[PDB]
Design a protein around this motif. Sequence first.
Motif, short mmCIF file in Angstrom:
data_model
loop_
_atom_site.label_atom_id
_atom_site.label_comp_id
_atom_site.label_asym_id
_atom_site.label_seq_id
_atom_site.Cartn_x
_atom_site.Cartn_y
_atom_site.Cartn_z
N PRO A 160 0.80 -1.20 0.00
CA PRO A 160 0.00 0.00 0.00
C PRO A 160 0.85 1.26 0.00
O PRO A 160 2.01 1.27 0.50
CB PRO A 160 -0.82 -0.12 1.31
CG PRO A 160 0.03 -0.88 2.22
CD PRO A 160 0.75 -1.89 1.30
N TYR A 180 -0.76 -5.82 0.92
CA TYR A 180 -2.15 -6.22 0.76
C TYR A 180 -2.35 -7.58 0.08
O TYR A 180 -3.44 -8.22 0.23
CB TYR A 180 -2.97 -5.10 0.10
CG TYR A 180 -2.41 -4.51 -1.18
CD1 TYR A 180 -2.56 -5.19 -2.39
CD2 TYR A 180 -1.77 -3.29 -1.19
CE1 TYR A 180 -2.06 -4.65 -3.57
CE2 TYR A 180 -1.29 -2.73 -2.38
CZ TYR A 180 -1.44 -3.42 -3.57
OH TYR A 180 -0.98 -2.91 -4.76
N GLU A 187 -3.40 -12.85 0.96
CA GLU A 187 -4.30 -11.75 0.72
C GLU A 187 -4.77 -11.16 2.06
O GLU A 187 -5.25 -11.89 2.96
CB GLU A 187 -5.57 -12.18 -0.09
CG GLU A 187 -5.34 -12.92 -1.41
CD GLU A 187 -6.63 -13.17 -2.17
OE1 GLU A 187 -7.67 -13.25 -1.50
OE2 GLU A 187 -6.65 -13.26 -3.42
N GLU A 188 -4.68 -9.83 2.15
CA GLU A 188 -5.06 -9.10 3.33
C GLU A 188 -6.53 -8.76 3.14
O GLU A 188 -6.87 -7.87 2.36
CB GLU A 188 -4.16 -7.88 3.51
CG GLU A 188 -4.36 -7.13 4.81
CD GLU A 188 -4.19 -8.01 6.04
OE1 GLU A 188 -3.10 -8.52 6.31
OE2 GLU A 188 -5.18 -8.17 6.77
N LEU A 196 -9.00 -5.53 1.62
CA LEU A 196 -8.31 -4.62 0.71
C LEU A 196 -8.26 -5.21 -0.70
O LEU A 196 -8.13 -4.47 -1.69
CB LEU A 196 -6.90 -4.32 1.24
CG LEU A 196 -6.64 -4.25 2.74
CD1 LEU A 196 -5.17 -3.99 3.03
CD2 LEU A 196 -7.49 -3.18 3.45
N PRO A 233 -7.19 -5.13 -5.84
CA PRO A 233 -6.81 -4.22 -4.74
C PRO A 233 -7.67 -2.92 -4.64
O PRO A 233 -7.98 -2.29 -5.66
CB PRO A 233 -5.36 -3.87 -5.06
CG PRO A 233 -4.85 -4.98 -5.90
CD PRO A 233 -6.02 -5.59 -6.61
N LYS A 234 -8.00 -2.51 -3.42
CA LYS A 234 -9.02 -1.46 -3.17
C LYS A 234 -8.64 -0.05 -3.66
O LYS A 234 -7.51 0.16 -4.14
CB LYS A 234 -9.43 -1.46 -1.70
CG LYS A 234 -10.64 -2.36 -1.43
CD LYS A 234 -11.65 -1.73 -0.47
CE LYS A 234 -11.06 -1.40 0.88
NZ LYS A 234 -12.05 -1.70 1.96
N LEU A 257 -5.42 2.54 -2.99
CA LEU A 257 -4.48 1.87 -2.06
C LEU A 257 -3.08 1.58 -2.62
O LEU A 257 -2.06 1.70 -1.91
CB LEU A 257 -5.08 0.54 -1.61
CG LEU A 257 -4.44 -0.14 -0.40
CD1 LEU A 257 -4.43 0.76 0.82
CD2 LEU A 257 -5.22 -1.41 -0.15
#
Lengths: 175, 175
Positions: A76, A115, A143-144, A147, A151-152, A155
């Motif tokens: 991130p 992330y 994978e976090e 997020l 990916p969000k 980020l």
Amino acid sequence: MRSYRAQGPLPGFYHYYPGVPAVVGVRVEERVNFCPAVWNTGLSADPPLFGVSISPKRFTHGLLLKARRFSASFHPFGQKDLVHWLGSHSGREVDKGQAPHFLGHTGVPILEGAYAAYELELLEVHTFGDHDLFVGRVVAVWEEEGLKGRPKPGLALLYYGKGLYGRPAEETFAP
Amino acid sequence: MRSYRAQGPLPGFYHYYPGVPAVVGVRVEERVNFCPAVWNTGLSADPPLFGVSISPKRFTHGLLLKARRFSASFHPFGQKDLVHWLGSHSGREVDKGQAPHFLGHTGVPILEGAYAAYELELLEVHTFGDHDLFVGRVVAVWEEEGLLDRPKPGLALLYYGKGLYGRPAEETFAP
Ligand SMILES: Cc1cc2nc3c(=O)[nH]c(=O)nc-3n(C[C@H](O)[C@H](O)[C@H](O)COP(=O)(O)O)c2cc1C
Ligand SMILES: Cc1cc2nc3c(=O)[nH]c(=O)nc-3n(C[C@H](O)[C@H](O)[C@H](O)COP(=O)(O)O)c2cc1C
Ligand SMILES: O=Cc1ccc(O)cc1
Ligand SMILES: O=Cc1ccc(O)cc1
């Protein structure tokens, strides 16, 4: 539109930036090293393959050849300073293993804070001019959560070249 | 952090997104085609090499192998719809050559509106699972002086995967 013919290396080779820099983690016995690679790309879906282009000048290059396994981790925006640091010092001069990390299922080191990350088994290495492409097969996925797998918003760390970093804008568009 | 071992193709393979989609322009005699490729990356500075990873299923794939030359062009957020469109139909079903474009010094078609593009000579093709990596040598460079500093802040088109696009945030950082 201005044009010129190529006469050698370009004055700047950044036209296709920004990109996500993949952090490449590799362990040989007790020694752990990380280095960012912005020259990275998906190479196949079935089977899942991912490539990092690594200069034979990097301490990481020799480590990849010995271990034949590595991580690729995606961080991130909040970690721009750490990522830049890993990309601005060599494991020949500093122990980047002290960056907080964990060992994956295959024993590859994964830089804490990402992330997402892949554990990879090196399949082939191809020399193209002044870098070698290391083609890895994805054998595990980290994978976090929180997020489709994308990916969000806003980020991702982006690298524009020559020490300049960014992040995506928050707004997205689906034609 | 969740993890799993890979058992085949991943549920989504987007962990390393977003990236800049290269528009890949190819011409064989009278026929011109365009195809976005988000699996792209630099591969060498000296000499300058740039790679695009292209499924054997794309109409473009056969055209590259015949032409052995191609463009890679990089488009501002403003051309998001046109980029997407080129990415969701095939030259097997529509003349994409009607997209406004010009011919470069080596005869490759370049999609108009780009902030930058490379004319490439195809050097090698490598198969990695279900896509082939086309490695080109950059032989000419186009630049829209007004749109570059790299694209100027927030200009770059970003693809997140599965029909979702973005752009970089305006704010950058250089520690
Ligand atoms: C954002 C960023 C992206 C980078 N990408 C790459 C790359 O794709 N390939 C490469 O060979 N070096 C790349 N570098 C340079 C290495 O990260 C740098 O030379 C690093 O210090 C090498 O460490 P090592 O000698 O411990 O392997 C990059 C550096 C930065 C800051
Ligand atoms: C944003 C975007 C990025 C894409 N990247 C790739 C890629 O890297 N490799 C690939 O084989 N196809 C990619 N595609 C799919 C092709 O662009 C798409 O199949 C296109 O219809 C092929 O046209 P063709 O049959 O005329 O070559 C992408 C599509 C989009 C919309
Ligand atoms: O984008 C920066 C970069 C640095 C070193 C490389 O080898 C490749 C890319
Ligand atoms: O990210 C979209 C994409 C589509 C087709 C490909 O072959 C590769 C990537």
